[PDB]
Write a protein that binds this ligand. Structure first.
Ligand SMILES: [Cl-]
Ligand SMILES: [Mg+2]
Ligand SMILES: [Mg+2]
Ligand SMILES: [Mg+2]
Ligand SMILES: [Mg+2]
Lengths: 222, 196, 250, 204, 244, 241, 222, 195, 243
């Protein structure tokens, strides 16, 4: 996995690649690593895939209940506090590594969380096996006072670094833009630079090729 | 990490580098290891980032609840709460914390809490992997009742050396000044401190 | 110390009545009128905002509450009892459904869970029943729009339209004359406002009336864009201004 | 003593034009010893089909568990569970055993009866949902199945053509795995008819 | 202490009766009548809804007849909320048996366990009993078609035909009169409706105040089908027997 | 009639123990008042020290719940302190769990929920207190939220509590009819305190020395109580106008 | 199961005709790092007992708090707290001994070696040892760690058996203790020059000497 | 423990189980019956860890007998096998699992059909025409793959079983002291005394 | 009615009659007082000599909490001991977590909340004691009085028991005549006088005087009993004033 987060003028943007692996095998060539905790708070997750999904859903559920209880829009620091205390309690056995970002009444925010329970703050962050390729780009091209379109470019460039240079990362680039005063804008497959070329041959078989021993109609009705 | 806290005439100053580590990769080069547990009681964190954060969060909660009932806690009280957590959970923790605060009665005070969870009140304290390299320097250069400018220079020079030799230390030198006047945050960049 | 009340406080009397449930329904009768009407393309729930003092800000006290994005609730009876039921109802929609199936419960099943909570206050040790009747309006893909009433006993019934509380007897009769199976949502809002004016005595405007609908999806109220399948909440609370607009063509 | 490769077996699912296919082998063994050649790994609850590979005791247990849960679902909901919803139920149930998991590789397949859309999904032993337009693979010959599917598959195949593609994917994958084979079953699923075919394959 | 406010729900009267059970039965006698009739080729369940309002949604409604599994259903008389607590327990119990033995639960076993739960509330715990009486209608391959009833005491018995709720005395006499053993389902449908029509406290029996269900082997070959009647289907069966 | 001893319904659907807890509220014979400025929220309460042997500095019904939230109680001091300690604990836990300061209205709801439980559960009696929470919320601004033994709560433009609450309530109503606004249009909190004391004097018809009053003020980022000399300074300013 | 972090080295002691002497240096070691120099490892309990502790310092500070609490608890509802019902050395020891053996039996020991020195109410000398294992013993001379190997042989030349105790004065005894401390500074790699010494006499009472230094050292001979 | 076999023929299920009980370098007994009658038409053989085997067998026996008395009815072989599987499926994730492998031979009186189930300690159930647990299967399965026909008589099944025991007595390393053979059919369970 | 049969039940007035009944048990008890002074507090109590067979000086009633707090009470003596046992637990856990000895106001609320808790349920009985207590902390001297309802305040002087009104009147005179402050040694003498004057309300059996004190200068901020020469001196001062 390669995942990043970048702050700009009036908000924050996060991005991720779309490759899912089991060992050296690519299981999913277009999985979605960008998760929704609340409408305007989004998570990017690396590590154990089921752990990132489950921990993002649990805290997302509790955040919704909290928002309804308090009659307030949820804050990023609340999601941050809940995730970190949950992960710490399990002493790293829940392998979730997250970049948390979003906007709320307090402003725009960007954090990261490690499996053992530590949190980080930054203007630019990167997590996952392709984080070193991404961080190299971020350290080279980041500056103070980025615009929206500059931050998207920087974020997706950092993800591309991972896609090309990290074997754990590949396929496409997903992006989510969270700007203050506006709806969060999720850009699924914002970039698709890894389309499979036309195959040389059709492997459609003549009908009857496969030997059959028995046929029978299966009853699905009551 | 390299961290320290030093008492002086007008109060106490805390100091720290900004490097966070996962093996030889610097996970964060602009870390804030100086943490507020109360208005004028702060701590320096060394060891596990996750453990020290969870401890500091619990302490901050305890002192906020203390303040609600009994008013401003003493620096000694804050250190006792850190100790209680570190001592009773010694098997499951990797945390070396320095506690520093300003009273008006007691002025500046520094308590250091090593791995085992023991407490030690000192005029100044050094801790973290980089501290090993400055025991000699600090012992030779520390004086009691220094001025603000002198104490800033003492910490700046000390952490400069710790950063120079320890690979686990680096980035910026952050400091937090605790006096009757209030709370002042200082930052010092490589281009200044490296050529001291 | 400790709760020594491990026995039932609601028991059968010789005549077969359950006293505390009957008395809870009496508390509901005293409560301010609330109603619900089901249209072909939506549902409306409404009630009067009885202010305790003119110095009180009645906007801070919400009688109509969102339970899920497609389900809303209103009540008649004891406010505090309703408030905690909404808290519990919101939570049970997550714990016993959304955290299992990854989607919100259909109206009938959420209603069933609230009913269970209210039944247990009728049989468990050392508690009185809840002193409220609920009207729950909602939508789900396979059942469409629906409207349910939940009583202190835990019983629930589906309604085309109904009222509960102070002037429910007259309000139900009014709704029987006006309701047909071809009503559009705007027609149902109109009838809701007409029915409520009969039971309200003092001021009758957007500040003294609380009214919400279950209708079309509201993409503008979702808070984000990019997922085609997510189209927004069907629950919407009408504003003070939106009510007054409809009170002119009344 | 690796729980996921004691008994052996494989499952594969594919999508076509207004149809889905799900197939599995019949082998159950104890490491080298083949014990049963009748052990089917595909089950169904209404119109939703579930295939499960891995430790056979857990395959049996989970089938019994999801029959249990879908039966209660239908009684309360008064409708058959849909593939998208069942997928979420499988995920929840597996993650509930996060630190003591069922050693399985389940695969959901079916057609949503409301929208008519073909749906497939896969999971790891711990609940992670893997959704796919094209195909899902599972079992001791998953590497082989990934290779066969990636090369043989094309979009929008007709039910009769899709049968040939999925069958040839399973058969040739199974023959390169010692712990898979010993017979095979393919389910072709249309909006309101399901055909089950047993394949002739080599018995070694 | 709290002794002062304890009703003592699980004690004996001087005559050896259980106060709370007796009073719960008194409650049930005011609930809408429910009838079960067992024929040689199926079972009928018929029940009267409690005084209906014209604005009640009749089609999407369930009050009297509930499905426990594909082979077993129940007719309810008493507090609905109480009944749903017990119905969910019964539904779970059926699934436990199926999960354990890979066979659908025999009717009596399900009936015994539900009745045993009711019994517990009369002997220990200091809680009020469930104000509910069930008619169980179901099929299994041991005894075929079966009717049972249970009440708040936790006592259950088997029947060829039985009523619960209001006017059981009058209803039972009428069933005892016209019932015979070689009866068919369609005859039992007629007997059920005729009995309710004569015992009802309403002016006239209409489709909107009834719930109806049959359990036949009238599917295709050696298998059982549950039919919970729709509003229009009750309207038609009421015309077909000439009640309306 | 054991339905009047515990919190179960009476035949007319009432809870007498809750109603009698409301009557305990006035047992101290003290009146409180709360108003909002542009930047602040002021709460004032009467201070009656009858015994000469009492240490007057320890006699208080205003509590500092958190740095931002203050709470004045109308009711007996044991129940008052019980409510205060719980509120302090709840506000502290909220900050620890959710990473931001507990809002005044949310704490009000939470304490109201706890009160509701005592009206439903038999073994717990209601507390004979009415809790008025004040703050300058970072989202909602100046805020007044009030809780009672029934578990009811609501926000207020301004409010009053005590035996002579109705006189103070109408006095405030009549002012807001005149001013046509939701608050005291004043820059400094000092003059909002002066307004609060002035309108309490008019409504109750009594004059106050520096030891007859107790004042709490909420501003952005802190709630604080006034000393006797702070109130005296405020009393002098009213007299010289 | 533990491992000691900050540690204290030898505690040495002996009986003389009228009472007991006990000593321990002021060092808190952190492995090979001689980290803390103001550490007091002799803790007086009342005016008739001194407890000397070696081993883990965090556990020492815990034992300090226990003894401090024991004095408080003994004073409760006790009009003779400063007379007939004052804490005896034998009571303080048996309490600590109980705690040490209970902790070892729960597989979570207090990582210490402890010597309780004092004078009983009847004038009798009290000197007894207890450690992390709960092992207890008494002797005319007692020492922990390196002291057991180097101090005991020297102190046993003065008091070799019971009958030698009446023949030994406080001047002779203190001289032997001070000499032993010098020898430990020569030969223990975790000793400091600075130390504390306490005398508990049946006539003159408790004399607590702080900031003592090892002096008159022989090096001039390389 | 060690050798347990099962063969289902036209009208009956035949179970063969070794008589030896060995501990260390001593055969402690040569007449051990590794079977329990669960119900009149259901028999269960067992092999595995010492102690665990008999403890589990008798525990299952007690439960099925309890069921029989409660309902005045005999559970089908399929139902008994499912109950046993679930008990082992629970057991495998316990603090100390039952290390027992079983074969269940029964005659279903409602279907008039013999049935043979093989269940291992993990709770892995399969219905089979012939079954074996442990190292026995490595010889008998291939042998039965060749000689077994589905329409054989009980006598033909016994001859087919003699062929299995002969092969095991020739090629197995350990002396298992012969087998006790039992037949399950429409008339219940009986033991062959001369094998 | 019946509102007074169960604890925690509100009467129609808004009163808890069971607590008011516990107050009657307190009024029945012997007299105890507390005097706040320049740099500390003084406690005194009346001990009725029921018989010649009572060993003098050996049935001690004043109790110490921690090392700096004194507690005395009137009413059911066992109930007072239970409260002090809790007070000692509360003070120990405070010192354990926070290091510093528990401040007097903090300690006062610990007892207050605990006593208040015994008015919340019908399964417990209210405390049958009013407790006068206090000591010296970082902010100087504090004197408190705690009642069965859980109600407590700070006091310049405090009194409870059968002779409370006599003692209160005598306390008010000291507050009026000494606006600048009373010294610790003076307050000990005055405490003796007031107990002797308050003994007029219990004069069948003669009594034994018991005094204790905490003072920053005189006792170094710790709780001590007044004995020997200082006690006899205080007794003589009291004897001279009654005649
Ligand atoms: Cl709550
Ligand atoms: Mg460096
Ligand atoms: Mg193969
Ligand atoms: Mg082979
Ligand atoms: Mg209550």
């Amino acid at each position: 996995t390669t995942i990043v987060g970048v702050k700009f003028n009036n908000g924050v943007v996060i991005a991720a690649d779309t490759r899912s692996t089991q060992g050296p095998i690519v299981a999913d060539k277009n999985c979605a690593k960008l998760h929704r905790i609340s409408p305007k708070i989004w998570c990017a997750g690396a590590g154990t895939a089921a752990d990132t999904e489950a921990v993002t859903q649990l805290i997302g559920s509790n955040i919704e209940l909290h928002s309804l209880y308090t009659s307030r829009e949820p804050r990023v620091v609340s999601a941050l506090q809940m995730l970190k205390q949950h992960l710490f309690k399990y002493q790293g056995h829940i392998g979730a590594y997250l970049i948390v970002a979003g906007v709320d009444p307090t402003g725009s925010h960007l954090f990261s969380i490690h499996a053992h329970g530590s949190t980080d703050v930054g203007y630019y962050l990167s997590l996952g096996s392709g984080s070193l390729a991404a961080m190299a780009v971020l350290e080279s091209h980041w500056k103070q006072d980025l615009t929206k379109e500059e931050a998207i470019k920087l974020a997706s460039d950092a993800i591309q670094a991972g896609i090309w240079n990290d074997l754990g990362s590949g396929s496409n680039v997903d992006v989510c833009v969270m700007e203050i005063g506006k709806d969060a804008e999720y850009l699924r497959n914002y970039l698709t630079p890894n389309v499979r070329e036309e195959k040389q041959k059709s492997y459609k078989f003549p009908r009857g090729t496969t030997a059959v021993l028995k046929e029978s109609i299966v009853n699905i009705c009551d | 990490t390299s961290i320290m806290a030093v008492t002086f005439k007008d109060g106490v100053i805390l100091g720290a580098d900004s490097r966070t580590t996962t093996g030889a990769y610097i996970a964060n080069r602009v870390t804030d290891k100086l943490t507020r547990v109360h208005d004028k009681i702060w701590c320096c964190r060394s060891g596990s980032a996750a453990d020290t954060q969870a401890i500091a969060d619990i302490v901050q909660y305890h002192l906020e609840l203390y303040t609600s009932q009994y008013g401003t806690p003493s620096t000694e009280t804050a250190a006792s709460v850190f100790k209680e957590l570190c001592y009773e959970n010694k098997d499951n923790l990797t945390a070396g914390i320095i506690v520093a605060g300003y009273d008006d009665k007691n002025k500046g005070e520094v308590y250091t809490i090593p791995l085992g969870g023991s407490v030690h009140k000192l005029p100044y304290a050094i801790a973290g992997s980089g501290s090993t390299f400055i025991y000699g320097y600090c012992d030779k250069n520390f004086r009691e009742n220094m001025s603000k400018e002198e104490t800033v220079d003492f910490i700046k020079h000390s952490l400069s050396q710790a950063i120079k030799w320890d690979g686990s230390s680096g980035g910026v030198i952050r400091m937090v000044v605790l006096t009757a006047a209030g709370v002042e945050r200082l930052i010092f960049y490589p281009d200044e401190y490296e050529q001291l | 110390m400790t709760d020594r009340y491990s026995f039932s406080l609601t028991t059968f009397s010789p005549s077969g009545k359950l006293g505390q449930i009957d008395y809870a329904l009496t508390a509901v009768k005293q409560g301010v009128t609330s109603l619900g009407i089901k249209a072909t393309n939506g549902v409306v729930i409404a009630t009067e905002k009885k202010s305790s003092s003119p110095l009180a800000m009645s906007e801070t006290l919400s009688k109509v509450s969102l339970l899920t994005p497609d389900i809303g609730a209103v009540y008649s009876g004891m406010g505090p009892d309703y408030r905690v039921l909404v808290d519990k109802s919101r939570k049970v929609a997550h714990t016993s459904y959304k955290r299992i199936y990854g989607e919100y419960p259909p109206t009938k099943l959420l209603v069933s869970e609230v009913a269970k909570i209210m039944q247990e206050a009728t049989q468990s040790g050392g508690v009185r029943p809840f002193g409220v009747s609920l009207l729950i309006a909602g939508h789900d893909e396979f059942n469409g729009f629906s409207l349910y009433q939940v009583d202190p006993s835990g019983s629930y019934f589906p309604w085309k339209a109904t009222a509960i509380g102070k002037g429910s007897v007259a309000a139900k009769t009014f709704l029987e004359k006006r309701w047909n199976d071809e009503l559009e949502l705007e027609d149902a809002i109109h009838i809701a406002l007409l029915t409520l004016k009969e039971s309200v005595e003092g001021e009758f405007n957007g500040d003294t009336i609380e009214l919400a609908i279950i209708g079309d999806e509201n993409p503008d109220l979702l808070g984000y864009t990019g997922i085609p399948t997510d189209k927004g909440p069907r629950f919407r609370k009408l504003t003070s201004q939106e009510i007054n607009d409809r009170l002119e063509a009344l | 003593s690796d729980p996921s490769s004691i008994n052996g077996g494989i499952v594969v699912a594919m999508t076509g034009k207004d149809c889905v296919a799900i197939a599995c082998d019949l082998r159950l063994g104890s490491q080298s010893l083949g014990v049963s050649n009748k052990f089917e790994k595909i089950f169904h609850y209404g119109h939703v089909f579930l295939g499960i590979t891995g430790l056979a005791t857990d395959v049996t247990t989970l089938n019994e568990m999801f029959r249990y849960k879908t039966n209660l679902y239908k009684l309360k909901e008064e409708r058959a569970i849909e593939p998208e919803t069942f997928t979420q139920l499988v995920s929840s149930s597996l993650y509930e055993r996060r630190f003591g998991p069922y050693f399985v590789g389940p695969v959901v397949a079916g057609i949503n009866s409301k929208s008519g859309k073909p749906f497939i999904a896969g999971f790891d032993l711990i609940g992670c949902i893997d959704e796919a337009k094209d195909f899902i693979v599972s079992g001791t010959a998953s590497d082989q199945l990934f290779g066969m599917c990636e090369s043989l598959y094309e979009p929008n195949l007709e039910p009769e053509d899709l049968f040939e593609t999925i069958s040839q994917a399973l058969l040739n994958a199974a023959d390169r795995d010692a712990l898979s084979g010993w017979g095979a079953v393919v389910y072709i699923i249309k909006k309101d008819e399901v055909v089950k075919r047993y394949l002739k394959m080599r018995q070694d | 202490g709290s002794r002062r406010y304890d009703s003592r729900t699980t004690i004996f009267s001087p005559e050896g009766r259980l106060y709370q059970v007796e009073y719960a039965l008194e409650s049930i006698s005011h609930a809408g009548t429910a009838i079960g009739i067992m024929a040689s080729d199926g079972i009928v369940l018929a029940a009267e809804r409690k005084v209906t309002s014209t604005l009640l949604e009749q089609d999407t409604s369930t009050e009297k007849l509930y499905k426990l599994n594909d082979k077993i259903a129940v007719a309810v008389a008493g507090l609905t909320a109480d009944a749903e607590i017990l119905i969910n327990t019964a539904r779970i119990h059926a699934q436990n048996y199926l999960k354990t033995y890979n066979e659908d639960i025999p009717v009596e076993i399900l009936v015994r366990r539900l009745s045993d739960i009711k019994q517990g509330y009369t002997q220990h715990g200091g809680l009020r009993p469930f104000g509910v009486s069930f008619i169980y209608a179901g099929y299994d391959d041991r005894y075929g078609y079966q009717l049972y009833t249970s009440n708040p005491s936790g006592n259950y018995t088997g029947w060829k035909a039985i009523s619960v709720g209001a006017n059981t005395s009058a209803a039972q006499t009428l069933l005892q009169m016209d019932y015979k053993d070689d009866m068919k389902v369609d005859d039992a449908i007629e007997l059920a409706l005729k009995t309710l029509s004569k015992t009802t406290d309403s002016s006239a029996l209409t489709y909107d105040r009834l719930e109806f269900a049959t359990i036949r082997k009238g599917a295709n070959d050696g298998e059982v089908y549950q039919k919970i009647f729709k509003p229009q289907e009750i309207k038609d069966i009421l015309v077909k027997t000439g009640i309306t | 009639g054991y339905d009047r001893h515990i919190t179960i319904f009476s035949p007319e659907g009432r809870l007498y123990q809750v109603e009698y807890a409301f009557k305990a509220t006035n047992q101290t014979n003290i009146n409180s008042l709360a108003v909002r400025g542009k930047d602040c929220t002021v709460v004032i309460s009467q201070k009656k020290v009858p015994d000469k042997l009492l240490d007057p500095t320890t006699v208080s019904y205003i509590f500092c719940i958190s740095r931002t939230i203050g709470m004045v109680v109308n009711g007996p001091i044991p129940d008052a302190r019980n409510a205060a300690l719980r509120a302090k604990a709840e506000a502290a836990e909220f900050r620890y769990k959710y990473g931001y300061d507990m809002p005044c209205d949310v704490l009000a709801k939470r304490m109201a929920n706890l009160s509701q439980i005592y009206t439903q559960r038999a073994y717990m009696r209601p507390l004979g207190v009415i809790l008025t929470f004040v703050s300058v919320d970072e989202e909602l601004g100046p805020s007044i939220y009030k809780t009672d033994p029934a578990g009811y709560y609501v926000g207020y433009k301004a409010t009053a509590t005590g035996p002579k609450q109705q006189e103070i309530t109408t006095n405030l109503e009549n002012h807001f009819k005149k001013s046509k606004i939701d608050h005291i249009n004043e820059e400094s909190w000092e003059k909002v305190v002066e307004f609060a004391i002035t309108h309490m004097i008019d409504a109750l018809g009594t004059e106050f020395s520096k030891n007859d009053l107790e004042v709490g003020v909420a501003t952005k980022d802190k709630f604080f109580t006034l000393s006797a000399e702070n109130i005296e300074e405020r009393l002098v300013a009213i007299a010289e106008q | 199961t533990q491992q000691p972090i900050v540690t204290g080295t030898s505690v040495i002691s002996m009986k003389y005709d009228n009472g007991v002497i006990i000593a321990a240096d002021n060092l808190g070691s952190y492995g090979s790092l001689l980290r803390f120099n103001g550490v007091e490892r002799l803790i007086p309990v009342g005016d008739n007992t001194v407890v000397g502790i070696s081993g883990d310092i965090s556990d020492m500070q815990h034992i300090e708090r226990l003894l401090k609490d024991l004095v408080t608890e003994n004073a409760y509802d006790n009009p003779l707290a400063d007379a007939e019902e004052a804490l005896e050395p034998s009571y303080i020891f048996e309490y600590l001994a109980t705690v040490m053996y209970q902790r070892r039996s729960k597989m979570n020991p207090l990582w210490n070696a402890i010597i309780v020195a004092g004078v009983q109410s009847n004038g009798d000398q009290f000197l007894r040892y207890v450690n992390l294992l709960g092992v207890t013993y008494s002797s005319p001379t007692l020492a922990t760690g390196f002291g057991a190997h180097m101090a005991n042989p020297l102190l046993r030349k003065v008091v070799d058996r019971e009958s030698d105790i009446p023949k030994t004065t406080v001047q002779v005894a203190e001289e032997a203790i001070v000499n032993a401390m010098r020898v430990l500074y020569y030969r223990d790699a975790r000793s400091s020059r600075n130390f504390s010494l306490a005398i508990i006499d049946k006539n003159t009472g408790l004399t607590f000497k702080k900031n003592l230094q090892v002096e008159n050292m022989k090096w001039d001979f390389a | 423990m060690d050798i347990i076999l099962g063969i289902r023929v036209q009208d009956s299920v035949i179970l063969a189980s070794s008589k030896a009980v060995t501990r260390g370098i001593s055969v402690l007994k040569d007449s051990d019956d590794k079977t329990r009658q669960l119900s009149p038409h259901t028999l269960m053989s067992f092999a595995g860890e010492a102690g665990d085997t008999v403890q589990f067998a008798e525990y299952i026996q007690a439960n099925i007998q309890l069921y029989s008395i409660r309902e005045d009815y005999e559970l089908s072989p399929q139902a008994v096998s499912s109950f046993v599987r679930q008990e082992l499926a629970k057991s495998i994730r316990s603090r100390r699992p039952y290390q027992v492998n079983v074969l269940i031979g029964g005659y279903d009186k409602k279907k008039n059909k013999p049935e043979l189930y093989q269940i291992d300690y993990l709770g892995t159930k399969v219905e089979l025409p012939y079954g074996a647990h442990g190292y026995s299967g490595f010889y008998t399965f291939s042998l039965l793959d060749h000689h077994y026909r589905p329409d054989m008589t009980t006598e033909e099944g016994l001859d087919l079983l003699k062929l299995c025991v002969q092969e095991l007595e020739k090629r197995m390393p350990m002396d298992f002291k012969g087998v006790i053979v039992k037949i399950v059919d429409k008339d219940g369970i009986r033991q062959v005394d001369d094998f | 009615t019946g509102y007074d049969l169960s604890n925690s039940v509100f009467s129609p007035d808004g009163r808890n009659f069971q607590v008011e009944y516990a107050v009657k048990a307190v009024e029945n008890g012997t007299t105890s007082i507390g005097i706040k002074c320049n740099d500390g507090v003084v406690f005194a109590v009346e001990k009725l000599i029921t018989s010649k067979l009572l060993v003098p000086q050996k049935n001690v009633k004043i109790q110490v909490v921690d090392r700096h707090i004194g507690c005395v009470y009137s009413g059911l003596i066992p109930d007072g001991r239970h409260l002090v046992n809790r007070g000692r637990e509360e003070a120990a856990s405070f010192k354990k977590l926070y290091k510093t000895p528990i401040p007097i106001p903090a300690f006062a609320d610990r007892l207050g909340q605990y006593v208040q808790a015994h008015t919340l349920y019908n399964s417990v009985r209210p405390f049958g004691v009013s407790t006068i207590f206090g000591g010296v902390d970082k902010n100087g001297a504090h004197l408190y009085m705690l009642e069965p309802s859980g109600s407590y305040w700070g006091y310049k002087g405090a009194a409870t028991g059968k002779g409370r009104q006599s003692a209160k009147a005598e306390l008010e005179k000291l507050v009026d005549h000494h606006p600048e402050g009373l010294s610790a040694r003076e307050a000990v003498k005055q405490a003796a006088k007031i107990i002797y004057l308050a003994h007029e309300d219990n004069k069948e059996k003669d009594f034994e005087l018991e005094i204790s004190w905490c003072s920053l200068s005189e006792t170094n901020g710790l709780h001590k009993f007044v004995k020997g020469d200082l006690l006899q001196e205080a007794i003589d001062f009291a004897q001279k004033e009654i005649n």
